[PDB]
Amino acid sequence: LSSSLKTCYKYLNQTSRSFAAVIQALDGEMRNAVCIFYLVLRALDTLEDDMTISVEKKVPLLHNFHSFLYQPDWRFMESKEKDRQVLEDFPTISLEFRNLAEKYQTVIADICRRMGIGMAEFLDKHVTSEQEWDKYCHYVAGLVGIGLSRLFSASEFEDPLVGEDTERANSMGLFLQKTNIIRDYLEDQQGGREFWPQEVWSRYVKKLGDFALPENIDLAVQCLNELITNALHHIPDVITYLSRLRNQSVFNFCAIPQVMAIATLAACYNNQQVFKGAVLIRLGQAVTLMMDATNMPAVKAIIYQYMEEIYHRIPDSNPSSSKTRQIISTIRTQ
Amino acid sequence: LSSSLKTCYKYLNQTSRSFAAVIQALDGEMRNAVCIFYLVLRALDTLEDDMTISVEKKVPLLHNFHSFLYQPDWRFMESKEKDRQVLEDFPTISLEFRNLAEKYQTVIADICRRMGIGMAEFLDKHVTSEQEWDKYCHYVAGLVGIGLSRLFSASEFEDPLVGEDTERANSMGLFLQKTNIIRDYLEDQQGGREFWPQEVWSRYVKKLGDFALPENIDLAVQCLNELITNALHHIPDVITYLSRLRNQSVFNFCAIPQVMAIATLAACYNNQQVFKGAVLIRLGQAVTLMMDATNMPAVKAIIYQYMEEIYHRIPDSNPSSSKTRQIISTIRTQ
Amino acid sequence: LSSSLKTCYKYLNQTSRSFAAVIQALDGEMRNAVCIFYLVLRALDTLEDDMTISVEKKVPLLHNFHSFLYQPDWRFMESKEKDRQVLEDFPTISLEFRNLAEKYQTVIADICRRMGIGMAEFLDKHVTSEQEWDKYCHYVAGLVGIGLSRLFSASEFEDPLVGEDTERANSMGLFLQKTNIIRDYLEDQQGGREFWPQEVWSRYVKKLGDFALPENIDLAVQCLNELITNALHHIPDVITYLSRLRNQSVFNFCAIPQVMAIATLAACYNNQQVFKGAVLIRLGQAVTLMMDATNMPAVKAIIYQYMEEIYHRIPDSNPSSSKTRQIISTIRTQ
Amino acid sequence: LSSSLKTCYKYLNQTSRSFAAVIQALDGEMRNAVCIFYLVLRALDTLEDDMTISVEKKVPLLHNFHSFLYQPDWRFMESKEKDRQVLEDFPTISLEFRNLAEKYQTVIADICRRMGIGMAEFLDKHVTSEQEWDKYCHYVAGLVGIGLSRLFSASEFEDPLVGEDTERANSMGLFLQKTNIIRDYLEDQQGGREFWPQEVWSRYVKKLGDFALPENIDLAVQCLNELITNALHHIPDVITYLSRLRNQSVFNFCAIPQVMAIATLAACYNNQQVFKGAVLIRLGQAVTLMMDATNMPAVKAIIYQYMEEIYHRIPDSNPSSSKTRQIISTIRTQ
Amino acid sequence: LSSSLKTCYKYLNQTSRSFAAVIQALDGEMRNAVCIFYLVLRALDTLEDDMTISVEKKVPLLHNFHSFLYQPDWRFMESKEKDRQVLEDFPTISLEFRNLAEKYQTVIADICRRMGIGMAEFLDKHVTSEQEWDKYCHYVAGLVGIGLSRLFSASEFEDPLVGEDTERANSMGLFLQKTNIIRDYLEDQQGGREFWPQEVWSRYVKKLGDFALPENIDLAVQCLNELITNALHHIPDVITYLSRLRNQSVFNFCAIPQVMAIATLAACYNNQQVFKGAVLIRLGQAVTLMMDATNMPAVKAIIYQYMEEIYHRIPDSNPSSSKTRQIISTIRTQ
Amino acid sequence: LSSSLKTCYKYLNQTSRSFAAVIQALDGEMRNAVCIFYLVLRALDTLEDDMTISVEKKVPLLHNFHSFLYQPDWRFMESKEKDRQVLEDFPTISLEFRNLAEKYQTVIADICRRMGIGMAEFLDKHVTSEQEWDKYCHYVAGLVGIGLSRLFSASEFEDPLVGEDTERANSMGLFLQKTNIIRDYLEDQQGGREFWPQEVWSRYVKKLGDFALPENIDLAVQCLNELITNALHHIPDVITYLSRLRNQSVFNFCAIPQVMAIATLAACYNNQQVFKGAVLIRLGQAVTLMMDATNMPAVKAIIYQYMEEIYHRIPDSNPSSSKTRQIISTIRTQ
Numbered sequence A, B, C, D, E, F: 001l002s003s004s005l006k007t008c009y010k011y012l013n014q015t016s017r018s019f020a021a022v023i024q025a026l027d028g029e030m031r032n033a034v035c036i037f038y039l040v041l042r043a044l045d046t047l048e049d050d051m052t053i054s055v056e057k058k059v060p061l062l063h064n065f066h067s068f069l070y071q072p073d074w075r076f077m078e079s080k081e082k083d084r085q086v087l088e089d090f091p092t093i094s095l096e097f098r099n100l101a102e103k104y105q106t107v108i109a110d111i112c113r114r115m116g117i118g119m120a121e122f123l124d125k126h127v128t129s130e131q132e133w134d135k136y137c138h139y140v141a142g143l144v145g146i147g148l149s150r151l152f153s154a155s156e157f158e159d160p161l162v163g164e165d166t167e168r169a170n171s172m173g174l175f176l177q178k179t180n181i182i183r184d185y186l187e188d189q190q191g192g193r194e195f196w197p198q199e200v201w202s203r204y205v206k207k208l209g210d211f212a213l214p215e216n217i218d219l220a221v222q223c224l225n226e227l228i229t230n231a232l233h234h235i236p237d238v239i240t241y242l243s244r245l246r247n248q249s250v251f252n253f254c255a256i257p258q259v260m261a262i263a264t265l266a267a268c269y270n271n272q273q274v275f276k277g278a279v280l281i282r283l284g285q286a287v288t289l290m291m292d293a294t295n296m297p298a299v300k301a302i303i304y305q306y307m308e309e310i311y312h313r314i315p316d317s318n319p320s321s322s323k324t325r326q327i328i329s330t331i332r333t334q
């Protein structure tokens, strides 16, 4: 087989410590299509995150990235990010992208283009409102869920409905993105970047960096809970999306990340550790550990289990305690 | 939508730890039917267990419980139990109960009726013979297995045979109940509760309480092993029962508790720790770690594995050693 | 139940503390067929391992073992091996063997016939080339995989294509055997048994036993990694074989031993402990704990994770470093 | 959808009156893969059949045809055959060939390379021995059967065995080819083409053209039956091949041609009309009409029906009568 | 077996010449559900077609038809159609309707209600724009498709996804309706009813009746081909819808009507006989004879076969030729 | 491989123009078991029908036929029948019979034993009542269906139920036999054979032979219709039997003859030709021309359409018209 495709899977394993295995487990055509999708996305993300690239220089690269997929010799050699290897050897990745069936190239290129537009659009401004937060998450993750969904339908491995329902697919992305943003608060603060919606933290402190100051630990945990509360609103759509899947390999690929995300929100809920160091995922409830995330009823059980971990811990004092219980209740009676 | 249905699910998660998540993961009509069935059973249980309610008041409550389901305003405000909330706000629960398709009401009402009669019967006595132990377990657990089964069949998510074969359904309940009774010897002794068959424990000591005395530990373990051998006899029926389920959400619901009970019996066998406190369930073998309880073949293997954990520990000096091997031998060959 | 059949399952559990459970979970006729097949193989294996039986007396026993299946009174009372009970009470075993439907009998007799010839051939000599290693594994393990596959097809539980593809069925056996031979180095040394191919370890030390001397540890690990690299080559065939299976009970039976063999290889890689005693099997990330080994996509994911575990610990200086990377690369990509 | 792909399918329907339909019905990837494979083979046949091409310009074209697939601009404008359009717009066809997954490209390219050899090799010489007749058919039909089988397996829609067993794939081709060659006796003669094996007809006349001559009819029908008996030998392999198929779209694609071919050999057997004109595709018995060629058992029954239809019309007179009855006996008892 | 159900099946066979057989072949509960669903639709249609009915008296009948199903004594004796029996004995029909499971009644009732509205809405209105043609069709045929899909899922013989996909379920109906409307020109003409979209025929003649006039055959044909081209646009959804089906009985039920519709569009395309009467169904050949319409690949082969017959007969003259090739090309390629 | 087994299939194709094809298409062990079964029955039938054999001598031959299977040298040289060949070379067939598994031999021997008894019993009488018509058919046909059904269940390709439900299996044979007896009236009459039940035909004419005389043509047809109506009664059981089969090869073997019988009755209904010559099957129809007889839903549809073809031709004045409409109505509603 192609040695360039082997190089691609090497990059996938280098850049995805967690999902390389389940991506490689996808049946037939989706395997390479998703591996390449992941890689071009990692290249785009590396370009977005690289702070040694001024905004004026970066915008045209984000805007035209989707077209670089068709420039056999294009590569980027000035990146200082950890995964700069995918940009420097981008010709190897784009070569394999161009070997994918055209119907997949069309989907992936379309996604990359729109993602570029949104990313550029967000280089000179922080996230203000929650509506803006959803817009940003849509661009960096929602679109990925939409892209992947359109590939599942185009491959016929899933029902045509999966790719058409862009809202449910967008939700899969928004749930994971918000979860990572919430969990990575401290890391992003030392990195010099702010993603938490300004309209939300500006009501607890005046500098998002303030949640790093112990004298505001309580105020932080309250804002933390408000965002987690905001994230939980996507679960109904996550369940609906997962319930339409019928291909086992695709189901594992989609379900596992969502379960991990919910497990993360659970561990972070009302946890002061989010503002000190890493939050190690609390592990196992007798029943959750009895099943895995490979069949829909089990995934539901696991999700509901984690729901309870949050509910049974909602403090009365918490300013969001009522909104938290409400959404968890709405999810339970779905 | 219903504020009452959301309230029922709130109580479910509040009062249920081992079934809340799996109950919510059930398909269609079974979801609400089992949720409410669990709440009405939880209410009856709370009454049955409240020792501040005199026998004079308790007998009529148990006997008539089933009709309270149809008395819109019925409720009980004198319970001193932890879950008393389901009794005080029973109208909400019964409201949702009368809301179920008539066929489910038939099942739930019939079970509460027979359950109330049986419980009322044991308020003044302890379990003597092994025949009375089955009888007692049948009233508090077997009937529940039979009710759930009849509900699965009524919903049509499972074949009629499931609800029809009451003996197998009964064994499902007896196996869980006998396992809990055996495991909680000490926790119950400290609570003034006795459930071990007197006809059995009397052959070792003059009082059931003596098994808590360090000098009778050897006799306690012989009694312990004998009771466990007794429980093992239900396994063939448990396997026959689970092997007939076609619906995944139902399978998950029924299999998990059974496997957990089996692991408990295995962890308790010939273990002095049963009489010193709460016995820890040592993990499984490499093969059990490789599979979960979500498909029948996997459950059989898990069950057969825990059976060998017991077989491997049977000491020739134990007075039940021979009977313990026989039932396990029989289970292996079927 | 048959007392003789009850006895076979007693022996099955006595000699197979790990596979007995999955064998007993096989659907219908495969259950007894595989049980008996395992016991006759265990008997044949015990004859081969017994060093108190001279070569001239062992050769006839191995060559004619297949016909004894049809001699009701045949047994062997001189073995001193741990599982000698299957030989001393073989009449009970061959009895249940003659009870199986003829289509299973034919496959089992054929495999024992061919296996006996192969075992006899290696009684005198030691494994020289890697090609001979393959031949020896083919005889003691590959034929078993082939026999089993034919038993799955005959029963109609698996498609006839499973039984027809002898190449991959053979690979299934070679992978398990090579893993066991690799892991059991020390144990085989302290037993006067040599299974590592000579044309391989001779390039590292003068006597295979030298690997047991701490001053050769570095050399022992290099040879270890070379053999492990060799075994990894069977994985593609293992994945292809497992992917063709349709019956759940058969899939569980076939996939679990493979995953465990892979976990083992992952643990032993570049591990000095292999040459000092036993190796403690660790365990990986959530993807591993979020899914079990009962569906193909999940088995693939588990295998890919263990592959990365080895890939990540590959030392540049290792003489097989490149080959290890390329075989793992092939598995990842294709 | 690419304009070039639409054009490819437009050509498919132009050049394939009786098949574009079942090719367009193939699942997923096999669709375009077989469409293009058919088109390129069409272009190669157009060159091999175009007598307005000097043998020295042709031989190199047939030999290097396989490499033009990678040359974007290659084309041929001097063809005057009816399907001159595929050569004239080959760039469009080669473009889509290069968009196929690499694993399909290598299969198609390899087959054209080898096919180009055999064709050039038989550009000047007619078929002499029967051995040569198989060689000839292998080069123009067998390899196509082998090529398709490798595509079927590489797509994973069919088992790995379908692609590996080249002899069986080869036979599917030989059978169709010999059948058409037999049926097309006259047309070939009224066109200067001689495909019937010389070493066989030379025993009936002096010039293969003498079969059209009315007085030699008896010897003609005698020769015709001998060839038909020769073709019948491929049936066992054809049944074996079809028996391994599991994908319905592939099964329809493979089965129809073989059944139509077998039906043809039955209509031409001991039929004088073969030397007077084209023969009609005679129906059959009430069956067939009541069984489609959509499931292997049905196809088997249909084949036997036609076998018997032939067997019956076997005159003791004919010199091949012995061999004909023999092969049909083998086919029916197998 | 009730005599009212027997009577319904008598009516079924009376009013449905070529579909009673396939309806009777439907598995389990779908059998009676569709038989009954077909009869209520016959009734409601008999009313909409009856002209001796006051438009102002007809409207209310259409609007309340859905409720008549629940009025035991309801019936209509003033109708003067051929299928008036289903109206005069509606109580026998509604009676059986009320015997259907609740879940099926809900669907059939709901569809009849929405259908009733649309039918009324078009009484004093002709078909103008093509979008209106789709609205009318959606009301008389489209909703029928949606109802059936819902019944399939409700019965659980088809995946819930079948019911959800209302758009493709609707296209199924539109395809059949446009086909009959196009084919039944003359008859409807000599009946006083106009269904062909005004915006379409107007661009050819002043009065839709003109096409009946011999001197306009040409203009008539062109308008014909343009409408046919309109209907062809539904094949992609048809193919997609049928591909999702998993139950054999349901497949036959949905596929057959679709195939015949296409076999009609082919027969009629560019054929003057359409205006001079009712054209015949006159075959296909070869690859067809080898396949019924009981498996997706065969239905695709059949569909593409007819698509070809239309494509070949496309007059270079026709003002829609281009659009005709464009859609047939998209159907071929995609 | 066997020269004798070769000869057996040779005879199977000379003595079975209606079952050879589908028998030879049976899976695995059923193939030879059935071929052999059909050959012994063939021989047994050749004895019973031979009139050159005195009754005095024929009785012993029919009673001990089941025993001749175990007499390697048994044969009959004095047969004058057309298929005498199977009796003269019976050892060749008895030889193969003895090569079959025992369970298959048990079935063929038993049926051959019970079949010899009934045939002998009818050597002296003609069929009187309709009850005696079922009895005669039971011995010569019903038992063949029962035998075959048991063979299917012993080979395990079908569940035990197929062989257990002797009633349904008997109805299969009765439908075919009655159909054949009805169709072969004339042929039989000219051969001096009479199978029509006297209690039925004596109500029309004085002697069964009178239906051969042209003046009795109308009376003959009415009797014909009454007999056809009788036979139709077995169709519900035919459908039940066919629908519970799961092996495709068995399904085809069972469905095809039945559908053939149904088509024949439909062709013979109210047809005067029955009494002048042989009737030709006018099968097919636009809708069924889209189906074959290889899947249950299709077989049901095909059967139903044939029922309608009959229902449509029922003469009002026909004395059995009521009964005919009744059975057909029942078949429609079941």
Ligand SMILES: CCCCCCCCCCCCCCC[n+]1ccn(CC(O)(P(=O)([O-])O)P(=O)(O)O)c1
Pocket (backbone or CB within 6 Å): F015, F016, F017, F018, F019, F020, F038, F041, F042, F045, F140, F141, F144, F145, F148, F149, F172, F173, F176, F177, F254
């Ligand atoms: C599961 C359904 C089983 C249905 C079994 C129906 C059995 C009907 C009675 C058959 C007994 C075996 C007769 C073998 C010899 N025989 C008797 C009559 N025939 C006539 C024929 O040779 P054949 O119909 O091929 O079997 P024909 O081609 O002239 O129709 C042949």
